[PDB]
Design an enzyme around this catalytic site. Structure first.
Site, PDB file in Angstrom:
ATOM      1  N   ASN A 151       5.259   8.688  -1.245  1.00  0.00           N
ATOM      2  CA  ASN A 151       4.512   7.458  -1.100  1.00  0.00           C
ATOM      3  C   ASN A 151       3.629   7.475   0.118  1.00  0.00           C
ATOM      4  O   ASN A 151       3.940   8.110   1.126  1.00  0.00           O
ATOM      5  CB  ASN A 151       5.456   6.238  -1.022  1.00  0.00           C
ATOM      6  CG  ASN A 151       6.012   5.998   0.400  1.00  0.00           C
ATOM      7  OD1 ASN A 151       5.417   5.313   1.241  1.00  0.00           O
ATOM      8  ND2 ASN A 151       7.113   6.665   0.687  1.00  0.00           N
ATOM      9  N   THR A 154       1.755   5.546   8.913  1.00  0.00           N
ATOM     10  CA  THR A 154       1.027   4.794   9.924  1.00  0.00           C
ATOM     11  C   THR A 154       0.653   5.800  10.981  1.00  0.00           C
ATOM     12  O   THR A 154       1.531   6.262  11.754  1.00  0.00           O
ATOM     13  CB  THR A 154       1.852   3.657  10.494  1.00  0.00           C
ATOM     14  OG1 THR A 154       1.994   2.662   9.476  1.00  0.00           O
ATOM     15  CG2 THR A 154       1.148   3.068  11.701  1.00  0.00           C
TER      16      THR A 154
HETATM   17  C1  LIG Z   1       7.915   3.496  -1.878  1.00  0.00           C
HETATM   18  C2  LIG Z   1       8.735   3.632  -0.608  1.00  0.00           C
HETATM   19  C3  LIG Z   1       8.526   2.818   0.483  1.00  0.00           C
HETATM   20  C4  LIG Z   1       9.240   2.883   1.645  1.00  0.00           C
HETATM   21  N1  LIG Z   1       9.041   1.964   2.632  1.00  0.00           N
HETATM   22  C5  LIG Z   1       9.787   2.096   3.778  1.00  0.00           C
HETATM   23  C6  LIG Z   1       9.717   1.147   4.735  1.00  0.00           C
HETATM   24  O1  LIG Z   1       8.944   0.159   4.702  1.00  0.00           O
HETATM   25  N2  LIG Z   1      10.445   1.281   5.888  1.00  0.00           N
HETATM   26  C7  LIG Z   1      11.365   2.276   6.033  1.00  0.00           C
HETATM   27  O2  LIG Z   1      12.001   2.315   7.078  1.00  0.00           O
HETATM   28  N3  LIG Z   1      11.491   3.178   5.030  1.00  0.00           N
HETATM   29  C8  LIG Z   1      10.718   3.080   3.928  1.00  0.00           C
HETATM   30  N4  LIG Z   1      10.906   3.965   2.927  1.00  0.00           N
HETATM   31  C9  LIG Z   1      11.912   5.025   3.090  1.00  0.00           C
HETATM   32  C10 LIG Z   1      13.284   4.767   2.447  1.00  0.00           C
HETATM   33  O3  LIG Z   1      13.809   3.593   3.118  1.00  0.00           O
HETATM   34  C11 LIG Z   1      14.261   5.920   2.585  1.00  0.00           C
HETATM   35  O4  LIG Z   1      14.543   6.155   3.981  1.00  0.00           O
HETATM   36  C12 LIG Z   1      13.779   7.204   1.894  1.00  0.00           C
HETATM   37  O5  LIG Z   1      13.204   6.832   0.659  1.00  0.00           O
HETATM   38  C13 LIG Z   1      14.847   8.269   1.734  1.00  0.00           C
HETATM   39  O6  LIG Z   1      15.903   7.780   0.872  1.00  0.00           O
HETATM   40  P1  LIG Z   1      16.053   8.265  -0.655  1.00  0.00           P
HETATM   41  O7  LIG Z   1      15.910   9.790  -0.649  1.00  0.00           O
HETATM   42  O8  LIG Z   1      17.374   7.657  -1.136  1.00  0.00           O
HETATM   43  O9  LIG Z   1      14.912   7.576  -1.373  1.00  0.00           O
HETATM   44  C14 LIG Z   1      10.210   3.865   1.753  1.00  0.00           C
HETATM   45  C15 LIG Z   1      10.443   4.713   0.660  1.00  0.00           C
HETATM   46  C16 LIG Z   1       9.709   4.585  -0.517  1.00  0.00           C
HETATM   47  C17 LIG Z   1      10.008   5.590  -1.598  1.00  0.00           C
HETATM   48  O1  LIG Z   2       4.937   1.705   4.353  1.00  0.00           O
HETATM   49  C1  LIG Z   2       5.215   2.930   3.974  1.00  0.00           C
HETATM   50  O2  LIG Z   2       4.251   3.695   3.681  1.00  0.00           O
HETATM   51  C2  LIG Z   2       6.493   3.657   4.350  1.00  0.00           C
HETATM   52  C3  LIG Z   2       7.152   3.235   5.506  1.00  0.00           C
HETATM   53  C4  LIG Z   2       8.248   4.022   5.952  1.00  0.00           C
HETATM   54  O3  LIG Z   2       8.893   3.806   6.934  1.00  0.00           O
HETATM   55  N1  LIG Z   2       8.511   5.162   5.267  1.00  0.00           N
HETATM   56  C5  LIG Z   2       7.823   5.544   4.142  1.00  0.00           C
HETATM   57  O4  LIG Z   2       8.048   6.567   3.545  1.00  0.00           O
HETATM   58  N2  LIG Z   2       6.783   4.811   3.691  1.00  0.00           N
END
Ligand SMILES: Cc1cc2nc3c(=O)[nH]c(=O)nc-3n(C[C@H](O)[C@H](O)[C@H](O)COP(=O)(O)O)c2cc1C
Ligand SMILES: O=C(O)c1cc(=O)[nH]c(=O)[nH]1
Ligand SMILES: CCOC(=O)c1[nH]c(C)c(Cc2ccc(C(F)(F)F)cc2)c1C
Length: 377
Positions: free
Chosen positions: A120, A194
């Site tokens: 993403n 970011t």
């Molecule tokens: C679409 C998307 C958006 C995310 N937005 C954030 C976010 O706003 N803040 C954050 O700390 N992590 C964000 N993450 C990261 C997830 O919280 C998580 O740490 C990461 O997806 C790894 O976990 P997983 O392998 O179970 O998905 C996002 C992940 C995805 C896929």
């Molecule tokens: O806003 C997102 O793009 C986002 C935030 C975050 O902390 N981690 C991530 O993979 N995506």
């Protein structure tokens, strides 16, 4: 539960919809549809007693089970209740920023089903701290009146707006608006989307950020019934770290976390360093899911050692099964967050993964989850 006999989280129809979504529908649209159903409280509930032998805590945060939903899933706090009621013990809403912003142009979320991976480039799309605060306040009011929600935990992840020069200004704004309603605050210095945000993991910058955040939280009582959250106490402070770090960086970060008495560390955010997923080759952003699992588990082991086991760990990255969760716990994690598991396994994810972990804790001979924490070491 029988997927055919009853409307429960394992209901068969949601697996049919999930397969259709994964094959045919844009990822962010699939996600928006999930949130639409949750907002209108259509989704099934897990009404089971969780096993007392799989509870866990971080200080006074008492998790009824060891699975929560990671940040970025309900960025705007619009369906907290329905997500929790799928069987999770906690959710991390956000990441929020002071002002609302749209994030990056769409499409910005892509899945690779074969590898159970996601990339993403969202860029902190959210409604802004004021509106998300209003959403969390409404949740907290429903929670006072609900048997199912009374012990669930809500953390809030905080970040900075796209054009903010000094991240601490934005973290302070959010704390002063939403901090009274949070069980913990997660400091997001690890988004890859970011530009420059991850520079704030440098030891000197990170120390000042943590101390500023703790000071602002500590001032909420001075400036101001107060704690309208689950713990009835000031929010704990967690930092969410990036996996793309060398050992020198990890070690200086550990020293700062010890020096500042941070309450927990979330290990980890997405990675920029996966490049063997062919359908992601032209794409920007951070990678989640099964190809992050080994990277993030190793980073857990490292930080657990580097902080001499004194800093509790919230695991994130590639957790799909009970075995994956146990691996995280044995590496050092006290509790797990899911995200990709819900994308690829759907509504049944929490019920399925709790059962699988309970069977492994038994088969492995553990009396309870707490005795597994850190046992690899
Ligand atoms: C679409 C998307 C958006 C995310 N937005 C954030 C976010 O706003 N803040 C954050 O700390 N992590 C964000 N993450 C990261 C997830 O919280 C998580 O740490 C990461 O997806 C790894 O976990 P997983 O392998 O179970 O998905 C996002 C992940 C995805 C896929
Ligand atoms: O806003 C997102 O793009 C986002 C935030 C975050 O902390 N981690 C991530 O993979 N995506
Ligand atoms: C990474 C982008 O997010 C997604 O690709 C996504 N996110 C979630 C939560 C899901 C799981 C899901 C299950 C059932 C439904 C339906 F409403 F159809 F039942 C909708 C979504 C998916 C596929």
């Amino acid at each position: 539960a029988d997927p055919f006999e009853s409307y429960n989280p394992e209901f068969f129809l949601y697996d049919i919809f999930l397969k259709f979504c994964l094959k045919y529908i844009d990822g962010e649209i699939c996600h928006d549809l999930f949130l639409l159903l949750g907002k209108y409280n259509i989704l099934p509930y897990d009404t089971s007693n969780d096993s007392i032998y799989a509870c866990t805590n971080i200080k006074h945060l008492d998790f009824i089970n060891p699975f929560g939903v990671a940040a970025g899933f309900d960025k705007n706090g619009v369906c907290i209740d329905s997500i929790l009621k799928l069987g999770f013990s906690f959710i991390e809403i956000g990441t929020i920023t002071p002002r609302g912003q749209t994030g990056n142009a769409k499409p910005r979320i892509f899945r690779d089903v074969e590898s159970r991976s996601i990339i993403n480039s969202c860029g902190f799309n959210n409604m802004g701290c004021d509106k998300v605060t209003e959403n969390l306040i409404l949740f907290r009011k429903r929670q006072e009146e609900d048997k199912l929600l009374s012990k669930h935990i809500v953390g809030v992840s905080i970040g900075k707006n796209k054009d903010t020069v000094n991240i601490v200004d934005d973290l302070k704004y959010c704390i002063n608006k939403i901090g009274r309603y949070a069980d913990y605050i997660a400091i997001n210095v690890s988004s890859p989307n970011t530009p420059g945000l991850r520079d704030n993991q440098e030891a000197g910058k990170l120390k000042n950020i943590i101390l500023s955040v703790k000071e602002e939280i500590d001032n909420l009582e001075k400036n101001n019934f107060l704690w309208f959250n689950t713990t009835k106490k000031k929010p704990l402070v967690f930092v969410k770290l990036a996996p793309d770090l060398n050992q020198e960086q990890k070690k200086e970060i550990a020293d700062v976390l010890l020096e500042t008495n941070i309450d927990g560390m979330i290990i980890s955010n997405t990675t920029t360093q996966i490049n063997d997923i062919k359908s992601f080759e032209n794409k920007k952003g951070g990678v989640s899911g099964a190809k992050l699992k080994d990277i993030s588990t190793k980073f857990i082991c490292e930080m657990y050692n580097y902080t001499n086991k004194q800093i509790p760990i919230i695991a994130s990255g590639g957790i799909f099964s009970g075995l994956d969760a146990l691996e995280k716990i044995e590496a050092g994690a006290s509790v797990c967050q899911l995200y990709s598991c819900l994308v690829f396994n759907g509504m049944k994810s929490a019920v399925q993964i709790k059962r699988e972990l309970n069977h492994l804790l038994y088969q492995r001979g553990y009396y309870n989850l707490k005795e597994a924490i850190g046992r690899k070491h």
